[PDB]
């Protein structure tokens, strides 16, 4: 169990700015397209809790995806899977077959049929007024949280200035996910003030649990506070 956050528990945009950070580092993660791949199989591993995949994403020909633990890795190792996730490159560590490259966390599901787009609605609350909503669509019945968070953060970044080069329309806020059984959890939308330079792996590692949910039922809520 993980209780909804208080105002003073959230990272602040102005703190990130006054410790000299560049919010655009976070902007890029969510404007930039995701790594995707349908029905792929891992070619190798680096450490035993990651899986390396052949993939085409801009100029990169493979992706290391990291999992929270070995057993998670073994769960996808050698099987036919879909990948959907947020790549990073700075601080990425991926040795050649025989250093730098493309990395991400989690993002894996088993490749099945699944096929029809499902629509999910995201309710946005700003300074405590529920004033906006927008839909995202995925075609996976079981979908990782990453795929949903990304598409939701993408929209808000394109349309509501969630992340700008040097700040944001907002000061703070979080994305809350509530499953059919009423368990729920959230993610602070903004970086820790100490996270300068921006180290992507410490921001993306929340996707490492490779958490997977039912697209038909998942509830999605975003809460934001302006200055």
């Amino acid at each position: 169990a993980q209780p909804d956050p208080k105002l003073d528990e959230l990272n602040k945009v102005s703190d990130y700015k006054s410790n000299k950070g560049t919010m655009g580092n976070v902007m890029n993660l969510y404007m930039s397209p995701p790594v995707e791949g349908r029905g792929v199989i891992n070619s190798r591993q680096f450490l035993s809790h990651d899986l390396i995949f052949p993939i085409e994403y801009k100029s990169y020909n493979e992706v290391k995806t990291e999992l929270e633990n070995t057993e998670l890795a073994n769960n996808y190792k050698g099987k036919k899977v879909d990948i959907f996730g947020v790549p990073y490159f700075y601080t990425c560590i991926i040795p050649k077959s025989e250093f730098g490259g493309c990395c991400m966390y989690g993002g894996l599901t088993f490749n099945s049929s699944e096929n029809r787009d499902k629509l999910i609605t995201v309710q946005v609350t700003i300074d405590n007024r529920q004033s906006l909503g927008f839909t995202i669509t995925t075609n996976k019945n079981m979908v990782t949280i990453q795929e949903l968070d990304y598409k939701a953060r993408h929209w808000l970044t394109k349309e509501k200035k969630l992340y700008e080069f040097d700040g944001s329309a907002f000061e703070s806020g979080y994305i809350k996910f509530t499953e059919k059984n009423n368990t729920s959890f959230w993610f602070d939308l903004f970086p820790k003030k100490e996270l300068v330079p921006f180290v992507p792996y410490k921001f993306l590692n929340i996707y490492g649990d490779n958490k997977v949910v039912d697209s038909k039922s998942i509830k999605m809520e975003v809460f934001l506070n302006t200055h």
């Binding site: 580092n25 801009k58 601080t91 730098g100 300068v196 330079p197």
Partner: protein, 109 residues
């Protein structure tokens, strides 16, 4: 060569959106963008530690940057002002060594 800036000279107009482009062939993770002005010396505007990353130097205001790939680092003046008339230098680096380009003379009217 090693570090190639582009264009070498450029005139532009107040309110114009300019992109100075920089290209390295050294496979260096780190790239920098400075302006030179006779008052001050080189002053660092933005730098970058890898693809996808940008961090602020000492005088980042009114500028933005993008590192869309290993080899390329771009400085971007959003809405240009005459006070951004200057010579701009790009550098890649590793450890203690810094490899500068030939510079970019930009005048803003």
């Amino acid at each position: 060569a090693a570090v190639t800036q582009s264009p070498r000279n450029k005139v532009a107009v107040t309110g114009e959106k300019v992109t100075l482009s920089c290209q390295q062939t050294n496979n260096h993770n780190n790239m920098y963008w400075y302006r030179q002005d006779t008052g001050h010396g080189l002053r660092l505007i933005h730098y970058s530690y890898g693809v996808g990353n940008t961090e602020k130097g000492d005088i980042p205001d009114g500028y933005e940057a993008s590192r869309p790939s290993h080899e390329q680092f771009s400085l971007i003046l959003v809405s240009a002002t005459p006070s951004q008339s200057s010579v701009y230098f790009c550098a890649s680096g590793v450890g203690g060594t810094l490899y500068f380009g030939a510079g970019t003379r930009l005048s803003v009217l």
